[PDB]
Amino acid sequence: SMATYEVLCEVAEKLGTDDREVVLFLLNVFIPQPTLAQLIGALRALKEEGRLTFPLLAECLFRAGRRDLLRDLLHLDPRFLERHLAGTMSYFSPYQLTVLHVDGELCARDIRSLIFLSRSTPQTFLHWVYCMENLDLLGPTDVDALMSMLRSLSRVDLQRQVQTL
């Protein structure tokens, strides 16, 4: 299965300011605070270098939290895809899935404190994680740079799920 170029444009229009950052992270190619041109520009490069398969995008929208779109553009049943991607193995790494979950369990007070504690990561948790990818501090092998930043913030309860995944 493969992601159609025409469908890819319809997904980029219906993606909000905050959703953009999440999708790009799950697809590996990430650009912080992206415009419509920047979002389609990365998507076109994945569907041109064969990487953008149909179930990679179907799962990408199911994991991002946009279950409305599966039945809108992809014409899939999100209830069947939910029951399907449970027994089926996930396209994404448990490191990509952990970062996305840690993102959701963060508060506005913590996200501002994140910046003042640590280019200089403009108002994004995924933007800070992207810095560590280039600065060799966060990776699927090493997540202790995040564990220290979690303990030294307030969310000490998130270190248990992180230590697992």
Numbering used by the authors: 0 to 117, 124 to 170
What did the paper state?
Pivotal to the survival of both tumors is the canonical NF-κB pathway that becomes constitutively activated by the virally encoded protein vFLIP. In contrast to the ubiquitin-dependent mechanisms, persistent IKK kinase activation by vFLIP proceeds via a direct association between vFLIP and IKKγ. Taken together, our results are the first to reveal that vFLIP-induced NF-κB activation pivots on the formation of structurally specific vFLIP–IKKγ multimers which have an important role in rendering the kinase subunits active through a process of autophosphorylation. Key to the formation of oligomeric vFLIP–IKKγ assemblies are interactions contributed by amino acids R12 and E104 in vFLIP.
An R12E vFLIP mutant was generated to maximally disrupt the vFLIP–IKKγ interactions and a D102R E104R vFLIP double mutant to disrupt vFLIP–vFLIP contacts. All were observed to have a similar elution profile during SEC MALS to that of WT vFLIP with the exception of R12E. Rather than eluting predominantly as a monomer (preceded by a small dimer peak), the R12E mutant had an enhanced dimeric component comparable to that of the monomer in terms of UV absorbance (left). The tendency of this mutant to dimerize was confirmed by native mass spectrometry and shown to be reducing agent dependent since treatment with 10 mM TCEP resulted in a shift to a predominant monomer when re-investigated using SEC (right). These observations could be explained by the crystal structure of the R12E mutant that was refined to 4.2 Å. In this structure, six R12E monomers form the asymmetric unit, two of which appear to be appropriately positioned for formation of a disulfide bridge mediated by C106, in an extended but weakly stabilized interface that also incorporates E12 and K13. Furthermore, ITC experiments confirmed that the R12E mutant had a similar Kd to that of WT vFLIP consistent with previous reports and the high levels of similarity between the R12E vFLIP and WT vFLIP co-ordinates in the vFLIP–IKKγ(150–272) complex when superposed. Whilst all mutants appeared unimpaired in their capacity to associate with IKKγ following immunoprecipitation consistent with our biochemical and biophysical assays and were expressed at similar levels, R12E displayed significant reductions in its capacity to phosphorylate GST-IκBα(1–54) and NF-κB activation. Although the D102R E104R mutant was the least disrupted and had a near WT elution profile, the R12E mutant lacked a defined hetero-octamer peak that was instead replaced by a broad range of interchanging higher molecular species extending from the hetero-octamer region almost to the void of the column. The fact that the R12E mutant appears capable of forming higher order species based on our SEC data, the lack of a clearly defined hetero-octamer coupled with the defective oligomerization observed in blue native gels suggests that the vFLIP–IKKγ assemblies capable of activating the IKK kinase are structurally specific.
